[PDB]
Write a protein that binds this ligand. Structure first.
Ligand SMILES: *[C@@H]1O[C@H](CO)[C@@H](O[C@@H]2O[C@H](CO)[C@@H](O)[C@H](O)[C@H]2NC(C)=O)[C@H](O)[C@H]1NC(C)=O
Lengths: 49, 39
């Protein structure tokens, strides 16, 4: 007959607590608007969003 | 711009990264003035 798999009985979830936010909304909503000729790049890492 | 480094041993390890948005063209090793070296 066909096969079978052992059904899980729990769930493991691990994350890094007390981590600051990425505050991406403040970067997009800025008064200084760039130009397509001199566009910049900002890297978001080690934060929550 | 990626850059690896090693202090002990031949294999290297990641050190840092940097974004510039431009293409690097040339490089040069300046001489050392001393009285008392290979690269
Ligand atoms: C909008 O962009 C400007 C850049 O033009 C940001 O101003 C910089 O703010 C940081 C602090 O977060 C300073 O270290 C820089 O010196 C500032 N650059 C300047 C004054 O040219 C600004 O923070 C951004 N956000 C807002 C809400 O204006």
């Amino acid at each position: 007959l066909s096969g079978f798999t052992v059904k899980p009985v729990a769930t493991v979830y691990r994350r890094i607590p007390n981590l600051p936010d990425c505050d991406i909304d403040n970067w997009l909503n800025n008064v200084s608007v760039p130009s397509p000729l001199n566009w910049e790049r900002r890297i978001f890492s080690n934060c929550n969003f | 711009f990626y850059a690896y480094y090693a202090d002990v041993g031949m294999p290297t390890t990641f050190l840092f990264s940097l974004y510039l948005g431009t293409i690097l063209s040339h490089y040069y090793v300046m001489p050392l003035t001393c009285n008392a070296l290979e690269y």
